[PDB]
Design an enzyme around this catalytic site. Sequence first.
Site, PDB file in Angstrom:
ATOM      1  N   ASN A   1       9.766   8.356   5.435  1.00 44.94           N
ATOM      2  CA  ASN A   1       8.499   9.377   4.792  1.00 44.94           C
ATOM      3  C   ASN A   1       7.644   9.898   5.876  1.00 44.94           C
ATOM      4  OD1 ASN A   1       5.325   8.176   3.945  1.00 44.94           O
ATOM      5  ND2 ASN A   1       6.970   6.589   4.848  1.00 44.94           N
TER       6      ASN A   1
ATOM      7  N   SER B   1      10.558   2.095   6.578  1.00 44.37           N
ATOM      8  CA  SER B   1      10.101   0.974   5.969  1.00 44.37           C
ATOM      9  C   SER B   1      11.551   0.492   5.179  1.00 44.37           C
ATOM     10  CB  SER B   1       9.148   1.244   4.633  1.00 44.37           C
ATOM     11  OG  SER B   1       9.467   2.558   4.387  1.00 44.37           O
ATOM     12  N   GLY B   2      11.947  -0.790   5.112  1.00 39.28           N
ATOM     13  CA  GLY B   2      12.967  -1.598   4.541  1.00 39.28           C
ATOM     14  C   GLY B   2      13.843  -2.487   5.539  1.00 39.28           C
TER      15      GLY B   2
ATOM     16  N   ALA C   1       0.867  -1.042   0.018  1.00 37.69           N
ATOM     17  CA  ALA C   1      -0.145   0.031   0.001  1.00 37.69           C
ATOM     18  C   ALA C   1       0.893   1.146  -0.064  1.00 37.69           C
ATOM     19  CB  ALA C   1      -1.049  -0.171   1.206  1.00 37.69           C
TER      20      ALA C   1
ATOM     21  N   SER D   1       4.559  -7.465   5.424  1.00 35.30           N
ATOM     22  CA  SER D   1       5.175  -6.319   4.836  1.00 35.30           C
ATOM     23  C   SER D   1       6.177  -5.589   5.618  1.00 35.30           C
ATOM     24  CB  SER D   1       4.078  -5.286   4.523  1.00 35.30           C
ATOM     25  OG  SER D   1       4.508  -4.377   3.742  1.00 35.30           O
TER      26      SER D   1
ATOM     27  N   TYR E   1       7.651  -3.455  -0.955  1.00 40.52           N
ATOM     28  CA  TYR E   1       7.821  -1.922  -1.390  1.00 40.52           C
ATOM     29  C   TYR E   1       9.121  -1.571  -1.434  1.00 40.52           C
ATOM     30  CZ  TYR E   1       5.963   2.990  -1.428  1.00 40.52           C
ATOM     31  OH  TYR E   1       5.877   4.264  -1.730  1.00 40.52           O
TER      32      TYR E   1
ATOM     33  N   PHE F   1       2.198   2.655  -2.659  1.00 37.00           N
ATOM     34  CA  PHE F   1       3.266   2.678  -3.914  1.00 37.00           C
ATOM     35  C   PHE F   1       2.331   3.251  -5.139  1.00 37.00           C
ATOM     36  CE2 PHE F   1       5.652   0.361  -7.223  1.00 37.00           C
ATOM     37  CZ  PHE F   1       6.986   0.357  -6.714  1.00 37.00           C
TER      38      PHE F   1
ATOM     39  N   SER G   1      -0.445   5.091  11.144  1.00 41.86           N
ATOM     40  CA  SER G   1       0.091   6.492  10.415  1.00 41.86           C
ATOM     41  C   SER G   1       1.358   6.786  11.100  1.00 41.86           C
ATOM     42  CB  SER G   1      -0.944   7.560  10.508  1.00 41.86           C
ATOM     43  OG  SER G   1      -1.547   7.550  11.860  1.00 41.86           O
TER      44      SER G   1
HETATM   45  C1  LIG Z   1       6.606   6.351   0.584  1.00 42.30           C
HETATM   46  C2  LIG Z   1       5.823   5.623   1.377  1.00 42.30           C
HETATM   47  C3  LIG Z   1       4.366   5.691   1.301  1.00 42.30           C
HETATM   48  C4  LIG Z   1       3.492   4.568   1.988  1.00 42.30           C
HETATM   49  N1  LIG Z   1       2.175   4.693   1.806  1.00 42.30           N
HETATM   50  C5  LIG Z   1       1.271   3.691   2.549  1.00 42.30           C
HETATM   51  C6  LIG Z   1      -0.169   3.991   2.366  1.00 42.30           C
HETATM   52  O1  LIG Z   1      -0.821   4.991   1.814  1.00 42.30           O
HETATM   53  N2  LIG Z   1      -0.942   3.079   3.022  1.00 42.30           N
HETATM   54  C7  LIG Z   1      -0.483   1.875   3.672  1.00 42.30           C
HETATM   55  O2  LIG Z   1      -1.145   1.142   4.252  1.00 42.30           O
HETATM   56  N3  LIG Z   1       1.058   1.952   3.741  1.00 42.30           N
HETATM   57  C8  LIG Z   1       1.896   2.617   3.191  1.00 42.30           C
HETATM   58  N4  LIG Z   1       3.242   2.594   3.221  1.00 42.30           N
HETATM   59  C9  LIG Z   1       3.934   1.417   4.019  1.00 42.30           C
HETATM   60  C10 LIG Z   1       4.062   0.252   2.956  1.00 42.30           C
HETATM   61  O3  LIG Z   1       2.971  -0.274   2.411  1.00 42.30           O
HETATM   62  C11 LIG Z   1       4.849  -0.887   3.703  1.00 42.30           C
HETATM   63  O4  LIG Z   1       4.006  -1.392   4.721  1.00 42.30           O
HETATM   64  C12 LIG Z   1       6.165  -0.475   4.306  1.00 42.30           C
HETATM   65  O5  LIG Z   1       6.734   0.488   3.214  1.00 42.30           O
HETATM   66  C13 LIG Z   1       6.860  -1.847   4.572  1.00 42.30           C
HETATM   67  O6  LIG Z   1       7.499  -2.343   3.450  1.00 42.30           O
HETATM   68  P1  LIG Z   1       8.853  -2.736   3.244  1.00 42.30           P
HETATM   69  O7  LIG Z   1       9.784  -2.421   4.404  1.00 42.30           O
HETATM   70  O8  LIG Z   1       8.991  -3.995   2.842  1.00 42.30           O
HETATM   71  O9  LIG Z   1       9.234  -1.507   2.271  1.00 42.30           O
HETATM   72  C14 LIG Z   1       4.252   3.455   2.647  1.00 42.30           C
HETATM   73  C15 LIG Z   1       5.530   3.402   2.773  1.00 42.30           C
HETATM   74  C16 LIG Z   1       6.621   4.451   2.123  1.00 42.30           C
HETATM   75  C17 LIG Z   1       7.770   4.238   2.022  1.00 42.30           C
HETATM   76  C1  LIG Z   2       9.191   6.257  -3.485  1.00 40.08           C
HETATM   77  C2  LIG Z   2       9.700   4.724  -3.657  1.00 40.08           C
HETATM   78  O1  LIG Z   2      11.241   4.818  -4.287  1.00 40.08           O
HETATM   79  C3  LIG Z   2      11.423   5.313  -5.492  1.00 40.08           C
HETATM   80  O2  LIG Z   2      11.196   6.658  -5.594  1.00 40.08           O
HETATM   81  C4  LIG Z   2      12.014   4.463  -6.475  1.00 40.08           C
HETATM   82  C5  LIG Z   2      11.398   3.759  -7.253  1.00 40.08           C
HETATM   83  N1  LIG Z   2      10.231   3.308  -6.890  1.00 40.08           N
HETATM   84  C6  LIG Z   2       9.573   2.705  -7.932  1.00 40.08           C
HETATM   85  C7  LIG Z   2       8.263   3.241  -8.112  1.00 40.08           C
HETATM   86  C8  LIG Z   2       7.257   2.507  -9.260  1.00 40.08           C
HETATM   87  C9  LIG Z   2       7.956   1.510  -9.980  1.00 40.08           C
HETATM   88  C10 LIG Z   2       7.273   0.816 -10.751  1.00 40.08           C
HETATM   89  C11 LIG Z   2       7.887  -0.205 -11.785  1.00 40.08           C
HETATM   90  C12 LIG Z   2       9.082  -0.579 -11.368  1.00 40.08           C
HETATM   91  C13 LIG Z   2       9.921   0.066 -10.330  1.00 40.08           C
HETATM   92  C14 LIG Z   2       9.152   1.048  -9.789  1.00 40.08           C
HETATM   93  C15 LIG Z   2       9.979   1.636  -8.630  1.00 40.08           C
HETATM   94  O3  LIG Z   2      12.112   3.107  -8.103  1.00 40.08           O
HETATM   95  C16 LIG Z   2      13.569   3.795  -8.193  1.00 40.08           C
HETATM   96  C17 LIG Z   2      13.349   4.826  -7.071  1.00 40.08           C
HETATM   97  O4  LIG Z   2      14.291   5.579  -6.710  1.00 40.08           O
HETATM   98  O1  LIG Z   3       1.297   8.316   3.512  1.00 42.04           O
HETATM   99  C1  LIG Z   3       2.013   8.274   4.356  1.00 42.04           C
HETATM  100  O2  LIG Z   3       2.429   9.217   5.354  1.00 42.04           O
HETATM  101  C2  LIG Z   3       1.880   6.903   5.090  1.00 42.04           C
HETATM  102  C3  LIG Z   3       1.021   5.934   5.076  1.00 42.04           C
HETATM  103  C4  LIG Z   3       1.138   4.644   5.840  1.00 42.04           C
HETATM  104  O3  LIG Z   3       0.310   3.890   5.888  1.00 42.04           O
HETATM  105  N1  LIG Z   3       2.597   4.333   6.152  1.00 42.04           N
HETATM  106  C5  LIG Z   3       3.541   5.103   5.851  1.00 42.04           C
HETATM  107  O4  LIG Z   3       4.737   4.751   6.032  1.00 42.04           O
HETATM  108  N2  LIG Z   3       3.271   6.312   5.427  1.00 42.04           N
END
Ligand SMILES: Cc1cc2nc3c(=O)[nH]c(=O)nc-3n(C[C@H](O)[C@H](O)[C@H](O)COP(=O)(O)O)c2cc1C
Ligand SMILES: CCOC(=O)C1=C(Nc2ccc3ccccc3c2)OCC1=O
Ligand SMILES: O=C(O)c1cc(=O)[nH]c(=O)[nH]1
Length: 361
Positions: free
Chosen positions: A114, A272-273, A65, A300, A323, A67, A185
Amino acid sequence: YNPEFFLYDIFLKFCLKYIDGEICHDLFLLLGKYNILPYDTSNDSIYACTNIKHLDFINPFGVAAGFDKNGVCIDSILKLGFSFIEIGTITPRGQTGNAKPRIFRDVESRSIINSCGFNNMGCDKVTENLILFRKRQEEDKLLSKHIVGVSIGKNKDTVNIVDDLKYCINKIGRYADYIAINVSSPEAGKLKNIILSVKEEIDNLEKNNLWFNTTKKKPLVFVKLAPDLNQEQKKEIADVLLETNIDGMIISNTTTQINDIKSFENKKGGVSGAKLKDISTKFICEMYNYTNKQIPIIASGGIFSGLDALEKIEAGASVCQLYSCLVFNGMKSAVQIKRELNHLLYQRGYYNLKEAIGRKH
Ligand SMILES: Cc1cc2nc3c(=O)[nH]c(=O)nc-3n(C[C@H](O)[C@H](O)[C@H](O)COP(=O)(O)O)c2cc1C
Ligand SMILES: CCOC(=O)C1=C(Nc2ccc3ccccc3c2)OCC1=O
Ligand SMILES: O=C(O)c1cc(=O)[nH]c(=O)[nH]1
Protein backbone atom coordinates in the site's frame (compact mmCIF):
# COMPACT_ATOMS: atom_id res chain seq x y z
CA TYR A 1 -17.98 -22.42 14.60
CA ASN A 2 -21.05 -20.61 13.06
CA PRO A 3 -22.67 -20.78 9.61
CA GLU A 4 -22.57 -16.89 9.66
CA PHE A 5 -18.69 -16.62 9.58
CA PHE A 6 -18.25 -19.45 7.02
CA LEU A 7 -21.00 -17.81 4.76
CA TYR A 8 -19.24 -14.36 4.82
CA ASP A 9 -15.87 -16.21 4.46
CA ILE A 10 -17.15 -17.34 0.99
CA PHE A 11 -18.41 -13.86 -0.08
CA LEU A 12 -14.97 -12.50 1.05
CA LYS A 13 -12.67 -15.14 -0.60
CA PHE A 14 -14.77 -14.29 -3.71
CA CYS A 15 -13.95 -10.53 -3.18
CA LEU A 16 -10.24 -11.50 -2.86
CA LYS A 17 -10.29 -12.90 -6.47
CA TYR A 18 -12.42 -10.22 -8.29
CA ILE A 19 -12.90 -6.86 -6.38
CA ASP A 20 -10.13 -4.20 -5.46
CA GLY A 21 -8.86 -4.41 -1.86
CA GLU A 22 -10.14 -1.00 -0.67
CA ILE A 23 -13.57 -1.77 -2.32
CA CYS A 24 -13.99 -5.17 -0.46
CA HIS A 25 -12.53 -3.47 2.66
CA ASP A 26 -14.79 -0.36 2.48
CA LEU A 27 -17.78 -2.70 1.71
CA PHE A 28 -17.13 -4.92 4.81
CA LEU A 29 -16.31 -1.74 6.82
CA LEU A 30 -19.89 -0.62 5.87
CA LEU A 31 -21.78 -3.80 7.06
CA GLY A 32 -20.05 -3.57 10.50
CA LYS A 33 -21.21 0.09 10.97
CA TYR A 34 -24.74 -1.31 10.16
CA ASN A 35 -23.80 -4.20 12.56
CA ILE A 36 -24.60 -7.26 10.30
CA LEU A 37 -21.16 -8.95 10.95
CA PRO A 38 -21.21 -12.13 13.14
CA TYR A 39 -20.13 -11.97 16.86
CA ASP A 40 -17.68 -14.09 18.93
CA THR A 41 -19.33 -14.19 22.44
CA SER A 42 -17.94 -17.55 23.85
CA ASN A 43 -15.75 -16.66 26.92
CA ASP A 44 -11.93 -16.62 26.31
CA SER A 45 -9.58 -18.90 28.39
CA ILE A 46 -8.20 -16.72 31.30
CA TYR A 47 -4.88 -18.63 30.62
CA ALA A 48 -4.64 -16.45 27.43
CA CYS A 49 -5.15 -13.21 29.44
CA THR A 50 -2.43 -10.54 28.81
CA ASN A 51 -1.49 -6.91 29.65
CA ILE A 52 1.10 -4.12 29.00
CA LYS A 53 1.98 -2.24 32.26
CA HIS A 54 -1.62 -1.77 33.71
CA LEU A 55 -3.50 -2.40 30.39
CA ASP A 56 -5.66 -5.60 30.60
CA PHE A 57 -6.51 -7.39 27.28
CA ILE A 58 -9.12 -10.20 27.87
CA ASN A 59 -7.34 -12.10 25.01
CA PRO A 60 -4.06 -11.21 23.17
CA PHE A 61 -5.56 -10.51 19.68
CA GLY A 62 -6.41 -7.04 18.32
CA VAL A 63 -7.00 -5.34 14.90
CA ALA A 64 -3.88 -3.39 13.73
CA ALA A 65 -3.70 0.36 12.90
CA GLY A 66 -5.02 1.55 9.48
CA PHE A 67 -7.83 -1.07 9.35
CA ASP A 68 -10.45 1.31 10.83
CA LYS A 69 -8.40 4.57 10.36
CA ASN A 70 -11.58 6.73 10.78
CA GLY A 71 -13.13 4.56 13.59
CA VAL A 72 -16.52 3.94 11.86
CA CYS A 73 -17.28 0.25 12.84
CA ILE A 74 -15.20 -0.15 16.10
CA ASP A 75 -18.25 -2.22 17.34
CA SER A 76 -18.50 -5.20 14.98
CA ILE A 77 -14.69 -5.65 14.52
CA LEU A 78 -14.10 -6.15 18.33
CA LYS A 79 -17.25 -8.42 18.47
CA LEU A 80 -15.45 -10.82 16.01
CA GLY A 81 -13.35 -11.76 19.11
CA PHE A 82 -10.47 -9.19 19.28
CA SER A 83 -9.72 -7.89 22.80
CA PHE A 84 -8.57 -4.50 21.36
CA ILE A 85 -8.51 -2.41 18.11
CA GLU A 86 -6.00 0.33 17.08
CA ILE A 87 -7.62 3.28 15.20
CA GLY A 88 -5.83 5.86 13.07
CA THR A 89 -3.30 6.66 12.10
CA ILE A 90 -4.99 10.14 12.29
CA THR A 91 -3.28 13.50 11.38
CA PRO A 92 -4.55 16.79 12.94
CA ARG A 93 -5.71 17.72 9.34
CA GLY A 94 -7.53 14.78 7.57
CA GLN A 95 -6.24 13.72 4.07
CA THR A 96 -7.73 11.88 0.97
CA GLY A 97 -4.22 10.27 0.69
CA ASN A 98 -2.40 9.13 -2.52
CA ALA A 99 -4.45 8.47 -5.74
CA LYS A 100 -6.25 5.09 -6.17
CA PRO A 101 -5.94 2.18 -6.30
CA ARG A 102 -3.24 2.13 -3.48
CA ILE A 103 -3.88 -1.23 -1.68
CA PHE A 104 -2.87 -4.36 -3.65
CA ARG A 105 -3.13 -7.90 -2.18
CA ASP A 106 -1.18 -11.06 -3.19
CA VAL A 107 -3.28 -14.25 -2.70
CA GLU A 108 -0.43 -16.86 -2.99
CA SER A 109 2.30 -15.04 -0.98
CA ARG A 110 -0.55 -13.72 1.35
CA SER A 111 1.14 -10.23 1.16
CA ILE A 112 -0.20 -6.62 0.83
CA ILE A 113 1.53 -3.47 -0.59
CA ASN A 114 0.00 0.00 0.00
CA SER A 115 0.84 3.67 -0.71
CA CYS A 116 -2.35 4.95 1.13
CA GLY A 117 -0.64 8.24 2.21
CA PHE A 118 -2.30 8.25 5.71
CA ASN A 119 -5.79 8.95 4.25
CA ASN A 120 -7.98 9.87 7.32
CA MET A 121 -11.08 12.08 7.97
CA GLY A 122 -8.88 14.10 10.43
CA CYS A 123 -8.33 13.98 14.27
CA ASP A 124 -11.53 16.14 14.66
CA LYS A 125 -14.09 13.93 12.79
CA VAL A 126 -12.52 10.69 14.24
CA THR A 127 -12.55 11.79 17.99
CA GLU A 128 -16.39 12.26 17.55
CA ASN A 129 -16.70 8.70 16.00
CA LEU A 130 -14.75 7.20 19.01
CA ILE A 131 -16.71 9.19 21.71
CA LEU A 132 -20.06 7.95 20.17
CA PHE A 133 -18.60 4.40 20.78
CA ARG A 134 -17.28 4.99 24.41
CA LYS A 135 -20.99 5.91 24.93
CA ARG A 136 -22.15 2.70 23.06
CA GLN A 137 -19.45 0.86 25.19
CA GLU A 138 -21.29 1.52 28.55
CA GLU A 139 -24.75 0.39 27.18
CA ASP A 140 -23.59 -2.71 25.14
CA LYS A 141 -22.27 -5.72 27.18
CA LEU A 142 -19.84 -7.07 24.55
CA LEU A 143 -17.54 -3.94 24.65
CA SER A 144 -16.81 -4.06 28.44
CA LYS A 145 -12.97 -4.33 28.95
CA HIS A 146 -12.21 -4.11 25.14
CA ILE A 147 -9.22 -1.67 24.69
CA VAL A 148 -9.21 1.03 21.94
CA GLY A 149 -5.83 2.64 21.29
CA VAL A 150 -5.33 5.45 18.73
CA SER A 151 -2.43 5.69 16.21
CA ILE A 152 -1.37 9.35 15.54
CA GLY A 153 1.11 10.83 12.99
CA LYS A 154 1.95 14.21 11.33
CA ASN A 155 0.22 15.96 8.33
CA LYS A 156 2.08 15.46 4.96
CA ASP A 157 3.37 19.11 4.85
CA THR A 158 3.71 19.61 8.68
CA VAL A 159 4.55 22.99 10.34
CA ASN A 160 6.19 20.94 13.18
CA ILE A 161 5.99 17.10 13.77
CA VAL A 162 5.45 17.38 17.59
CA ASP A 163 2.65 20.02 17.30
CA ASP A 164 0.67 17.74 14.90
CA LEU A 165 0.57 14.99 17.64
CA LYS A 166 -0.01 17.72 20.32
CA TYR A 167 -3.28 18.83 18.60
CA CYS A 168 -4.20 15.07 18.29
CA ILE A 169 -3.75 14.10 22.01
CA ASN A 170 -5.56 17.35 23.09
CA LYS A 171 -8.50 16.36 20.80
CA ILE A 172 -8.71 12.54 21.33
CA GLY A 173 -6.30 11.63 24.25
CA ARG A 174 -9.26 11.40 26.77
CA TYR A 175 -11.00 8.51 24.85
CA ALA A 176 -7.96 6.28 23.98
CA ASP A 177 -6.72 3.39 26.20
CA TYR A 178 -3.32 4.06 24.57
CA ILE A 179 -1.76 6.60 22.17
CA ALA A 180 0.31 5.20 19.25
CA ILE A 181 2.98 7.51 17.76
CA ASN A 182 4.17 6.20 14.37
CA VAL A 183 7.37 7.38 12.60
CA SER A 184 6.92 4.45 10.13
CA SER A 185 5.40 5.74 6.83
CA PRO A 186 5.98 4.15 3.39
CA GLU A 187 17.67 10.82 14.35
CA ALA A 188 17.21 9.26 17.87
CA GLY A 189 17.37 12.69 19.65
CA LYS A 190 14.50 14.05 17.47
CA LEU A 191 12.57 10.88 18.52
CA LYS A 192 13.35 11.33 22.28
CA ASN A 193 11.98 14.93 21.91
CA ILE A 194 8.73 13.64 20.23
CA ILE A 195 8.16 10.87 22.87
CA LEU A 196 8.80 13.40 25.73
CA SER A 197 6.73 15.94 23.69
CA VAL A 198 3.86 13.35 23.63
CA LYS A 199 4.04 12.29 27.34
CA GLU A 200 3.91 16.09 28.21
CA GLU A 201 0.47 16.72 26.56
CA ILE A 202 -0.88 13.49 28.20
CA ASP A 203 0.57 14.90 31.51
CA ASN A 204 -1.14 18.28 30.60
CA LEU A 205 -4.59 16.62 30.05
CA GLU A 206 -4.45 15.34 33.71
CA LYS A 207 -3.53 18.82 35.17
CA ASN A 208 -5.91 21.08 33.10
CA ASN A 209 -9.20 19.25 34.05
CA LEU A 210 -11.96 13.01 32.63
CA TRP A 211 -10.67 9.67 31.16
CA PHE A 212 -13.89 8.47 29.34
CA ASN A 213 -11.93 5.37 28.09
CA THR A 214 -11.94 1.65 29.26
CA THR A 215 -8.99 1.92 31.81
CA LYS A 216 -10.50 5.32 32.87
CA LYS A 217 -6.76 6.21 33.34
CA LYS A 218 -4.27 8.26 31.20
CA PRO A 219 -3.42 6.57 27.86
CA LEU A 220 -0.07 4.70 27.64
CA VAL A 221 2.45 6.00 25.02
CA PHE A 222 3.47 3.38 22.39
CA VAL A 223 5.68 4.15 19.36
CA LYS A 224 5.21 2.09 16.10
CA LEU A 225 8.70 1.48 14.55
CA ALA A 226 9.53 0.11 11.02
CA PRO A 227 11.73 -2.96 10.32
CA ASP A 228 13.94 -1.10 7.73
CA LEU A 229 16.72 0.21 10.05
CA ASN A 230 20.33 -0.96 10.79
CA GLN A 231 21.53 -2.41 14.16
CA GLU A 232 23.28 1.00 14.74
CA GLN A 233 20.04 3.05 14.17
CA LYS A 234 18.12 0.40 16.26
CA LYS A 235 20.39 0.32 19.43
CA GLU A 236 20.51 4.20 19.23
CA ILE A 237 16.65 4.08 19.41
CA ALA A 238 16.29 1.37 22.17
CA ASP A 239 18.32 3.68 24.55
CA VAL A 240 15.92 6.64 23.91
CA LEU A 241 13.01 4.28 24.84
CA LEU A 242 14.57 3.37 28.23
CA GLU A 243 15.66 7.11 28.55
CA THR A 244 12.00 8.14 27.74
CA ASN A 245 11.02 5.20 30.08
CA ILE A 246 8.44 4.57 27.28
CA ASP A 247 5.26 2.52 28.06
CA GLY A 248 5.95 0.28 25.03
CA MET A 249 6.83 -0.16 21.32
CA ILE A 250 4.51 -1.77 18.60
CA ILE A 251 7.14 -3.77 16.55
CA SER A 252 6.58 -3.25 13.68
CA ASN A 253 4.94 -1.50 10.64
CA THR A 254 5.33 -2.17 6.83
CA THR A 255 8.83 -3.05 5.45
CA THR A 256 9.92 -1.72 1.98
CA GLN A 257 12.87 -4.19 1.42
CA ILE A 258 10.85 -7.06 -0.25
CA ASN A 259 11.10 -7.37 -4.12
CA ASP A 260 10.60 -11.18 -4.61
CA ILE A 261 6.81 -10.58 -5.13
CA LYS A 262 5.96 -10.63 -8.92
CA SER A 263 2.52 -8.83 -8.86
CA PHE A 264 4.19 -6.02 -6.76
CA GLU A 265 7.23 -5.39 -8.98
CA ASN A 266 5.39 -2.45 -10.68
CA LYS A 267 4.21 -1.05 -7.29
CA LYS A 268 5.61 1.31 -4.61
CA GLY A 269 4.85 1.42 -0.83
CA GLY A 270 5.30 -0.72 2.32
CA VAL A 271 4.47 -4.48 2.47
CA SER A 272 2.43 -6.24 5.23
CA GLY A 273 1.79 -10.01 5.52
CA ALA A 274 3.65 -13.32 5.13
CA LYS A 275 6.93 -11.94 3.61
CA LEU A 276 7.10 -9.38 6.54
CA LYS A 277 6.48 -11.96 9.41
CA ASP A 278 10.09 -13.38 9.62
CA ILE A 279 11.70 -9.87 9.35
CA SER A 280 9.42 -8.67 12.26
CA THR A 281 10.02 -11.77 14.50
CA LYS A 282 13.77 -10.91 14.24
CA PHE A 283 12.95 -7.18 14.89
CA ILE A 284 11.31 -8.11 18.30
CA CYS A 285 14.25 -10.44 19.22
CA GLU A 286 16.76 -7.56 18.66
CA MET A 287 14.75 -4.67 20.24
CA TYR A 288 13.98 -7.13 23.12
CA ASN A 289 17.75 -7.76 23.78
CA TYR A 290 18.80 -4.04 23.57
CA THR A 291 16.00 -2.67 25.89
CA ASN A 292 17.11 -5.63 28.12
CA LYS A 293 13.47 -6.96 28.60
CA GLN A 294 12.39 -3.54 30.04
CA ILE A 295 9.91 -2.29 27.32
CA PRO A 296 6.57 -4.09 26.58
CA ILE A 297 6.13 -5.00 22.85
CA ILE A 298 2.94 -5.41 20.68
CA ALA A 299 3.62 -7.70 17.65
CA SER A 300 2.35 -6.73 14.14
CA GLY A 301 3.86 -8.29 10.95
CA GLY A 302 2.50 -11.43 9.27
CA ILE A 303 0.50 -13.14 12.09
CA PHE A 304 -2.03 -15.72 10.71
CA SER A 305 -1.79 -19.02 12.75
CA GLY A 306 -1.62 -19.50 16.56
CA LEU A 307 1.96 -20.70 15.81
CA ASP A 308 2.75 -17.36 14.01
CA ALA A 309 1.38 -15.58 17.17
CA LEU A 310 3.32 -17.77 19.69
CA GLU A 311 6.63 -17.12 17.76
CA LYS A 312 6.06 -13.35 18.52
CA ILE A 313 5.38 -13.88 22.28
CA GLU A 314 8.35 -16.31 22.83
CA ALA A 315 10.40 -13.58 20.98
CA GLY A 316 8.92 -11.10 23.54
CA ALA A 317 5.52 -9.73 22.31
CA SER A 318 3.02 -9.47 25.25
CA VAL A 319 0.20 -8.81 22.65
CA CYS A 320 -0.70 -9.47 18.92
CA GLN A 321 -2.34 -7.11 16.36
CA LEU A 322 -3.73 -8.76 13.16
CA TYR A 323 -4.21 -7.01 9.79
CA SER A 324 -3.29 -9.20 6.74
CA CYS A 325 -4.81 -12.26 8.55
CA LEU A 326 -8.32 -10.71 8.19
CA VAL A 327 -7.74 -9.77 4.50
CA PHE A 328 -6.84 -13.41 3.64
CA ASN A 329 -8.29 -15.84 6.26
CA GLY A 330 -11.33 -13.64 7.14
CA MET A 331 -13.81 -13.00 10.01
CA LYS A 332 -13.14 -16.40 11.74
CA SER A 333 -9.48 -15.13 12.09
CA ALA A 334 -9.96 -14.23 15.82
CA VAL A 335 -11.92 -17.46 16.65
CA GLN A 336 -9.60 -19.71 14.57
CA ILE A 337 -6.23 -18.21 15.78
CA LYS A 338 -7.38 -17.97 19.48
CA ARG A 339 -8.49 -21.68 19.47
CA GLU A 340 -5.12 -22.47 17.72
CA LEU A 341 -3.01 -20.66 20.43
CA ASN A 342 -4.73 -22.21 23.53
CA HIS A 343 -4.16 -25.65 21.83
CA LEU A 344 -0.45 -24.56 21.47
CA LEU A 345 0.32 -22.84 24.85
CA TYR A 346 -0.91 -26.24 26.14
CA GLN A 347 1.18 -28.42 23.76
CA ARG A 348 4.20 -26.37 24.98
CA GLY A 349 3.30 -26.71 28.71
CA TYR A 350 2.77 -22.95 29.31
CA TYR A 351 0.57 -22.55 32.46
CA ASN A 352 -0.42 -19.08 31.07
CA LEU A 353 0.55 -16.80 28.11
CA LYS A 354 2.45 -14.21 30.26
CA GLU A 355 4.79 -17.14 31.24
CA ALA A 356 5.67 -17.53 27.50
CA ILE A 357 6.68 -13.84 26.85
CA GLY A 358 10.33 -13.69 25.61
CA ARG A 359 11.18 -17.39 26.28
CA LYS A 360 13.79 -17.08 23.51
CA HIS A 361 16.46 -16.64 26.28
C1 LIG B 1 -3.73 -0.78 3.67
C2 LIG B 1 -2.98 -0.58 4.96
C3 LIG B 1 -3.11 0.58 5.74
C4 LIG B 1 -2.38 0.72 6.91
N1 LIG B 1 -2.52 1.84 7.65
C5 LIG B 1 -1.85 2.02 8.81
C6 LIG B 1 -1.98 3.23 9.66
O1 LIG B 1 -2.73 4.17 9.35
N2 LIG B 1 -1.28 3.33 10.78
C7 LIG B 1 -0.44 2.38 11.19
O2 LIG B 1 0.19 2.56 12.28
N3 LIG B 1 -0.27 1.23 10.47
C8 LIG B 1 -0.92 0.99 9.30
N4 LIG B 1 -0.75 -0.20 8.56
C9 LIG B 1 0.17 -1.23 9.06
C10 LIG B 1 -0.57 -2.28 9.89
O3 LIG B 1 -1.13 -1.67 11.07
C11 LIG B 1 0.36 -3.43 10.30
O4 LIG B 1 1.47 -3.02 11.12
C12 LIG B 1 0.98 -4.09 9.09
O5 LIG B 1 -0.04 -4.25 8.09
C13 LIG B 1 1.55 -5.44 9.47
O6 LIG B 1 0.45 -6.31 9.70
P1 LIG B 1 0.36 -7.78 9.04
O7 LIG B 1 1.70 -8.07 8.36
O8 LIG B 1 0.04 -8.62 10.28
O9 LIG B 1 -0.77 -7.60 8.07
C14 LIG B 1 -1.46 -0.37 7.35
C15 LIG B 1 -1.34 -1.52 6.57
C16 LIG B 1 -2.07 -1.64 5.39
C17 LIG B 1 -1.96 -2.85 4.52
C1 LIG C 1 -7.73 -3.59 2.74
C2 LIG C 1 -7.61 -4.89 3.50
O1 LIG C 1 -7.94 -5.98 2.64
C3 LIG C 1 -9.27 -6.08 2.05
O2 LIG C 1 -9.62 -5.24 1.24
C4 LIG C 1 -10.16 -7.16 2.45
C5 LIG C 1 -10.70 -7.33 3.65
N1 LIG C 1 -10.49 -6.55 4.71
C6 LIG C 1 -11.39 -6.53 5.71
C7 LIG C 1 -11.83 -5.31 6.23
C8 LIG C 1 -12.76 -5.29 7.27
C9 LIG C 1 -13.24 -6.49 7.79
C10 LIG C 1 -14.17 -6.47 8.83
C11 LIG C 1 -14.65 -7.66 9.35
C12 LIG C 1 -14.21 -8.87 8.83
C13 LIG C 1 -13.29 -8.89 7.80
C14 LIG C 1 -12.80 -7.70 7.27
C15 LIG C 1 -11.88 -7.72 6.24
O3 LIG C 1 -11.55 -8.51 3.67
C16 LIG C 1 -11.56 -9.15 2.38
C17 LIG C 1 -10.64 -8.23 1.60
O4 LIG C 1 -10.33 -8.38 0.43
O1 LIG D 1 -1.52 4.93 5.21
C1 LIG D 1 -0.45 4.53 4.86
O2 LIG D 1 0.11 4.79 3.80
C2 LIG D 1 0.25 3.67 5.81
C3 LIG D 1 0.44 4.01 7.14
C4 LIG D 1 1.15 3.11 8.00
O3 LIG D 1 1.40 3.31 9.20
N1 LIG D 1 1.58 1.95 7.40
C5 LIG D 1 1.41 1.60 6.08
O4 LIG D 1 1.85 0.55 5.62
N2 LIG D 1 0.72 2.50 5.31
